[PDB]
Amino acid sequence: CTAVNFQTGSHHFFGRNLDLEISYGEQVVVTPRNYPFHFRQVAPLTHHYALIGMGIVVDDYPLYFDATNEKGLSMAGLNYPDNADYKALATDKANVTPFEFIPWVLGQAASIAEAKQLLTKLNLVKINFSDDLPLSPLHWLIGDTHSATSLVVECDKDGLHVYDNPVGVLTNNPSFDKQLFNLNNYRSVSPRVQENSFQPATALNDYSRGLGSHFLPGGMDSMSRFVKVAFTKLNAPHSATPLEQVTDFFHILHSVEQPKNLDEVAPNQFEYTIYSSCVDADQGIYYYTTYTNNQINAVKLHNVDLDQAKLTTYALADQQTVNYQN
Amino acid sequence: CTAVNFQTGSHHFFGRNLDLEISYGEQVVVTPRNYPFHFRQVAPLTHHYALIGMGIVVDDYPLYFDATNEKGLSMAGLNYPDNADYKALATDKANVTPFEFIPWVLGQAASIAEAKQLLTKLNLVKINFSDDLPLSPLHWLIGDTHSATSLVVECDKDGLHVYDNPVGVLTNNPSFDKQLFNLNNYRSVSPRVQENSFQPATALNDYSRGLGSHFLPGGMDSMSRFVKVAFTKLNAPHSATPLEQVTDFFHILHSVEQPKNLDEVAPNQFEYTIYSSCVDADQGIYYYTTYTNNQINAVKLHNVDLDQAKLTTYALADQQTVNYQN
Amino acid sequence: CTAVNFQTGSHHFFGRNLDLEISYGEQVVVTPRNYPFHFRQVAPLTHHYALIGMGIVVDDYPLYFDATNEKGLSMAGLNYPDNADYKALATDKANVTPFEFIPWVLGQAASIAEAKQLLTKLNLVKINFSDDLPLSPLHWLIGDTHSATSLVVECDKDGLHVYDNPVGVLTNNPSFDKQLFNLNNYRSVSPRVQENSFQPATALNDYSRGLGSHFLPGGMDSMSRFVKVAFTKLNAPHSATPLEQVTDFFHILHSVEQPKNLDEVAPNQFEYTIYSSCVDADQGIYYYTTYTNNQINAVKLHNVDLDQAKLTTYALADQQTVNYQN
Amino acid sequence: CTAVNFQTGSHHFFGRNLDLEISYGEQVVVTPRNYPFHFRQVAPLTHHYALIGMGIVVDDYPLYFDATNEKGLSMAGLNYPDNADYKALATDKANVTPFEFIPWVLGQAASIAEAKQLLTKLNLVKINFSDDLPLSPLHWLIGDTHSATSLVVECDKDGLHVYDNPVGVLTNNPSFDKQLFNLNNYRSVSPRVQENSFQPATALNDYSRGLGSHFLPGGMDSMSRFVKVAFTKLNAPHSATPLEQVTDFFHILHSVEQPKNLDEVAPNQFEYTIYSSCVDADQGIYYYTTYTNNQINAVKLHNVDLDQAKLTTYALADQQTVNYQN
Ligand SMILES: [Ca+2]
Ligand SMILES: [Ca+2]
Ligand SMILES: [Ca+2]
Ligand SMILES: [Ca+2]
């Protein structure tokens, strides 16, 4: 998985690749303001901000992979195997399950600054959604429309960690302190061909455009994708119009998509990028591609009656949709 | 630039990324059988195989970047700076300019076997199209629908070279013997997590899916893209229908697209993937995406009257085309 | 700097490269049992285990870079810039300066088990030896002759950390959790040529012996040296005699020596391996080479009267000493 | 194998690592001026320049791995598997066997310029020394005391190649055009920490000295050792005295020695650096270390009666020779 919080030209785009070996029946899910969220161990949110994101609906409950609220606050949950350590109930904390975490934050917080207030009280508790659907190990990226900031939330064996993330990207393991530190090793990677420091008197031929990034990683693994997406995001252009910025964002995410069949997780099982999302967080527009359809599709939050109480779901436009010009 | 010859399930797909710092006004150009091909130093081709490909029409003439003929033979010209060496007129040989080379081969030859016969009589002559447009340094990939074989044509200072290319990919510099040899260094890269050979008694954590490709290159440079596209192409799935295979092909080419602004070629100039093409060579369908529009577009060769004599051109659908689902 | 704890055939060898840009006048220093160790903030050690190691005698006091006591316990202090955080005096704890730390542990403890007991009461206090010589930022490797265990001691801003280190090597930054984790990325490196997993159907030439370690790091930086020295140490042979094992040990340390002038730390200043040491910890024999003399030199702890109270120092044999055979 | 031609301060040092899985009984062999060389297919050299180098003596004939003559011309033969292609007899060439090549050149040539005259006539012929001792596939590095030049001689399937080699190093496969070209990919490696070009606004910590060489190869394979030894040689210091320059040379060669047991060539067989040589080519002094003895040993050409006709051989000082200081 890869998530990116991208800010250009006063605009804010947030989204992710979902990389998995099997699809769970993903849909774009709009949760209106009056859908009642009845949490296991904290106070209910029966009126709250509307949400749009990708998820599945089980027992009429929206299980979000990622979402953005009507105020521009976004979250994505990304696989964090072995490191995630959910906790026992704590009598002096807000006890929230990992499947409730996105609705709990996004339903009531409008900014990263406000989300930080919730995070100071949070205890992520080890309660399964159902006996059929045990908890996935996750960590989260959070972005908003009010700062250049991103947060990374990692609940580890030693406790809850909340990191500032100015780079604005996240993948899978290792924990964020190790992941971010690794960028230090790539300081010499460049968009330009560097000076010959190997030995200036030795005739080294600048034989290919792009030689500046010769040591950039391109593997399917979490650390390689973190480095590559950081370089790609940090060197993105600053386009003039919102749709061009969306196009730029998709080029960032697709730079670290996992194609079939390059990441084998089990015999006859390959992890690949099921979908790539980009939310225009200012407008509430959820754009996405899928592995099977290259055309960008969009669902507009504000085309739904946000005062309803029922979920609205859209099946993904999953079939390759070609424009036949003659 | 990157070009790929991809065969799966009786079907043949051939296509390329065009990576440049500026667009030249590219269009899909269909040259029908009776468009007369005039050459600077050989007899004209007044009746020939029809061609479909991407190019520029300059005055009255189609200057192709890549093309496929009605018999399934494909060619793409890719940047080959400094290594390309075009020749003086040779008395005993067919003297063809690099800009006439695609029409000359594809107009006459129906297969790799026939193309090889033409290449034994070929001299690529240093003659500019005009004073305006001097010759570009190129090398070529050739594929067909009769073999799992690709050819690489490189006209170097020491003469013309024609290589067998079973891997079926090509980028830019260096020459193909050095480029193909470099794959030997990546033998240990894997779709699956390899056994711990560093020291089996040491507890090394398999902490990320995709760790098998941890050492795969991801840079924008020619050698990095060659390695990555080879690994991605050689590990592609075998899908059931031609449209799904086209989708797989685009995931191969997009694995090594060059995003803005990661490859700086000069101050304020960045080489990026202008378009990516995929030709179904058995049906003559030219599919493409562009940097600015993610939807796949298609032009069908056989929707044109191939007995005409005039060119048929299609402007690229280059505006981002979103499917709004609500 | 690099330190290694190496065990083979019932024997224990411990030693280090000292990498600095300038030499400080290092000598082999034997501190006998009755040299009184005076400390700034704890009781003196008037009778203690004897020590042998490399250091500087400043006024009357031995400042050790590394040492081994008469019971087989060894310690080395290695540069740990920016991460080291020495502490204010703590009322409940043994307040020991970083320059007293080696005498404090090795003077009292005979094994890792006993050293661990001392570490539970330790506070490394920020007290300079003098205004002339301010404290250096360090972390420590500890080994013994009773286990195949090494300890890493790192006093960071968030407190004192003591890690188990089965691999038995240490360099400089980053902290040991990040450093040890990095070995996971090198699981596929091998002493032998690996199977072709890039694509088995593609003819990849096994063109060089040693291709199994094609991705092993060779740079002068701390993380590169950690990976290379780990691979080299973990794949060392098991030789029959102690002197042959010493030879094997020096090949391990020299695998990551820093030659002039490959590591520039400032204009006209290059960090290089001043000396490499190997202590036979069971016999108390301190072997070393220097950058300027390739012959191994040795000082035997037990050739000194260990009941004395005065220091015994040996100047390094640092002039290149050639055996002329004719 | 690795060979280096090193020039500093008006002095010339030439030498090599011999990397093999088994020792052949190597000795330092001095061939005096009147030892008769009776060649298979060219005129005899019964009076010629004296030679010193490492070799074996079989049937009273010196089979040199490497050698230097009394005029300062040096050659080393290094393993070149599969690529070496020795030829049939040629009636218009000087037909010289690969085992005669070093005596044939060094016996009669005093400079690279003179050796070039011999190379224009050379045909390396496929004649075994004996049925017991078939030819090894080799390529050669040549240096002298009159230029900064080195030559590389490679007899390939397509013919004899003689390359200029200003870098002055050589290992094993691939052929020299591919080997030297590979240095282009390492232009950004540096003795100093490079500017942060990954993204200047992103806080990348310069956390380790030596980070400039983070991407330098350290593997046991031929291409890795070529890059590492080139960087190490090209960044060597310029020491003031001959013996210091010899010490510097050994640090260059030892930077790419192959330790046991990191290069497995067959079950229970590991290729390792049997010896490392350094010839002061101006003085005729053959210095060497061995895997088993770290002390430098030396044989002086001019301590032998060079007007004799019998070979003089010295067994290597192979046992670890320690200087016990107390
Ligand atoms: Ca609120
Ligand atoms: Ca941690
Ligand atoms: Ca002569
Ligand atoms: Ca060749």
Residue numbers in the entry:
A (entry chain B), B (entry chain A), C (entry chain A), D (entry chain B): 2 to 327
What does the literature reporting this entry say, word for word?
To examine the molecular foundations of BSH substrate specificity, we determined the crystal structures of six of the Lactobacillaceae BSHs examined above: four glycine-preferring (LgasBSHb, LaciBSHa, LingBSH, LreuBSH) and two taurine-preferring (LgasBSHa, LjohBSHc) BSHs. We examined the sequences of these loops and found that taurine-preferring enzymes exclusively contained G-V/T-G (‘G-X-G’) motifs, while glycine-preferring enzymes solely contained S-R-G/S (‘S-R-X’) motifs. While activity with MCBAs is relatively low compared with conventional BAs, some BSHs such as LingBSH and LreuBSH exhibit appreciable activity. To examine the recalcitrance of MCBAs more broadly, we monitored the deconjugation kinetics of 5 BSHs that had previously exhibited assorted substrate preferences (LingBSH, LgasBSHa, LgasBSHb, LjohBSHc and LreuBSH). LingBSH displays exceptional activity, suggesting that some BSHs may be uniquely adapted to process this expanded repertoire of BAs.
